[PDB]
DNA sequence: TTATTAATTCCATATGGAGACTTGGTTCCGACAATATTCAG
DNA sequence: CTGAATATTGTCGGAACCAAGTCTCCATATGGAATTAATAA
């Protein structure tokens, strides 16, 4: 009923073009992902180098 | 992008403490040598010059220049005053105009990467005024040292203090007195000064010499059709000058079917009677017509990732396929493999300019990848025992194929003009007999050919001399 | 009678768009220096 | 009567630019490709 936590963040590309191939295009996640242990983008680098308080 | 990373510090560096990204990409820590601009150039000061009121001069804009520093002067007098070019004259009579030294190396401050410095060398004659646009930089090193070792290298220095600025890319002489040339390769440059400038004239020279007899990819393909039909060419250029076209009701049905009364089909009606007075050999092209596709053109991203797509872009003068994609999309219609070229195939352009319309094209290179051509083009299989696509291409880019192209093809929106199959099937084309043909192509084909092999040596000298300035800077 | 074209609806092509995109460098307002004058008690 | 006025001229800075050049991607009828009920026969 919800993710793993072995992965959490989705950094091994797995399955997700088949979250909108067909079928499940239709139950897709178009949500922004979060991440908190690796970037290779740059809103989850701002996320980690700011230190806002 | 990049996670570059910097410290407050830092953006106190120039008198303007500005953070933009460019910048703080260029700054870095250093440990090398410095300079400043007071060791090499030296920034002159703006002024009105005394023009003469009875000479034709010269004058040079940023367009006038190219990315190779070779200034293209026009030439006006003061004594035409046209409202054609009266903007030049309007913004010489503001003060927008200086004349150079003889010795500074003039570099353009609105977009600073197109390689617009150019250098006014010492001995030469035929002044020519510059626009306050450009950056009279002067040096105390030899003016060709400076010059080399800004063309090619400090480049991406030279690029990094623009002003952004909400709209054009500019370069401003403030900055541009802070950058921080390294010693090694002034150094090293001119310790091979003595040499580096004799073979760098050699390249040069002989750049010239290959540029002296450059033609262009039209006229070779307006001068062999001209050639060979025996049509002078000073006179379908001044018939298509004069505009008063008058004809009847009655002409207006004949070969019609349609109906159309526009002006520019009676100037194309009026203009084949002066292209097939002598030539008796024109066939109507719908009998040699076996068939007409369009294409597909889906929603293309450009460098994406998909099956690649042909632009307007890839038809030349010459009847060949540039072949050379951009675009790719990633789209599917159940029938893509009947829109994916294959060599052999004749594409006229359906949709340009009024002048660029109607350019056809053979698909002379042999490519194992899948191409798809837009609905921009038409495919044309025509029976290979009268025509011989390759003559049609070169008859259509040629001005039998402008003059005709020009006055017929219709639209509302005359920049993207557009041809129908119709056009094509009422096309009455000069097909002399085989063995006329196979001799206007072939001559035009070695014309080209020749053109196309002094075309590479151009870009070949001219990359030999900044591979000579890389490695001589380098050592 | 077994045809029948001349009537239909159903998609792949063809024509057209009060166009739309792209590389590159031009006009021109608007502060602003340098005047640009001082009057004024 | 010394003054640094204001008051303009004329000229650097700068533009949610945008004039030049030229490539497009998509609605929409069509027409033909499927029927049909016709059509003789």
Redesign the interface.
């Known amino acids: 009923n919800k993710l793993k936590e072995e992965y959490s963040e989705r950094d091994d590309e797995e399955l997700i073009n088949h979250f909108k191939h067909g079928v499940l295009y239709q139950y897709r996640s178009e949500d922004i992902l979060l991440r908190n242990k690796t ?1 290779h983008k ?1 809103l989850d ?1 701002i996320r980690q ?1 700011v230190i806002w308080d | ?1 990049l ?1 570059q ?1 910097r410290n407050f510090s830092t953006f106190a560096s120039e008198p303007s403490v500005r953070f933009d990204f460019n910048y703080m990409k260029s700054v870095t820590p250093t440990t090398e040598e410095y300079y400043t601009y007071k060791s090499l150039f030296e920034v002159v000061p703006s002024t009105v010059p005394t023009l003469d009121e009875s000479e034709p001069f010269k004058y040079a804009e940023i367009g006038h220049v190219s990315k190779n520093g070779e200034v293209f002067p026009v030439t006006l007098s003061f004594e035409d005053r046209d409202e054609l070019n009266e903007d030049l004259f309007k913004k010489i009579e503001k003060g927008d105009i200086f004349l150079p030294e003889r010795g500074n190396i003039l570099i353009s401050a609105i977009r600073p990467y197109l390689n617009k410095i150019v250098l006014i060398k010492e001995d030469d004659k035929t002044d020519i005024y510059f626009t306050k646009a450009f950056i009279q930089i002067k040096p105390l090193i030899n003016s060709r040292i400076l010059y080399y070792a800004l063309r090619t290298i400090f480049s991406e220095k030279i690029n990094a203090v623009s002003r952004q600025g909400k709209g054009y890319p500019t370069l401003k002489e403030d900055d541009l007195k802070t950058i921080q040339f390294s010693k090694k390769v002034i150094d090293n440059l001119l310790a091979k000064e003595e040499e580096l400038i004799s073979n760098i004239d050699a390249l040069e020279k002989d750049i010239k010499e290959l540029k002296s007899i450059q033609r262009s990819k039209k006229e070779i393909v307006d001068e062999v059709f001209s050639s060979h039909f025996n049509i002078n060419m000073v006179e379908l250029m001044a018939l298509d000058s004069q505009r008063r076209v008058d004809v009847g009701l009655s002409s207006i049905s004949s070969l019609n079917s349609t109906i159309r009364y526009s002006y520019r089909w009676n100037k194309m009606k009026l203009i084949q009677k002066y292209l097939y007075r002598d030539i008796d050999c024109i066939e109507p092209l719908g009998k040699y017509i076996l068939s007409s596709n369009n294409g597909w053109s889906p929603e293309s991203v450009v460098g994406g990732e998909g099956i690649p797509i042909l632009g307007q872009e890839h038809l030349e003068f010459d009847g060949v396929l540039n072949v050379s994609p951009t675009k790719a999309t990633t789209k599917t219609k159940n029938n893509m493999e009947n829109f994916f070229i294959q060599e052999g195939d004749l594409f006229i352009s359906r949709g340009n300019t009024v002048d660029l319309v109607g350019l056809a094209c053979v698909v002379e290179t042999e490519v194992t990848e899948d191409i798809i051509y837009p609905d921009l083009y038409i495919r044309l299989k025509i029976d290979e025992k009268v025509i011989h696509k390759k003559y049609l291409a070169l008859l259509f880019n040629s001005f039998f194929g402008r003059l005709y192209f020009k006055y017929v093809s219709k639209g509302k929106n005359q920049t993207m003009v557009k041809i129908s199959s119709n056009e094509l099937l009422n096309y009455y084309l000069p097909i002399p007999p085989m063995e006329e043909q196979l001799e206007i192509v072939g001559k035009i084909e070695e014309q080209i050919g020749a053109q196309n092999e002094i075309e590479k040596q151009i870009e070949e000298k001219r990359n030999q001399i900044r591979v000579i300035i890389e490695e001589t800077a380098r050592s």
Do not use: C, F
Request: charged share 30%; net charge neutral; aromatic share 0%.
């Open positions: 970037v740059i680098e180098g | 992008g996670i990373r």
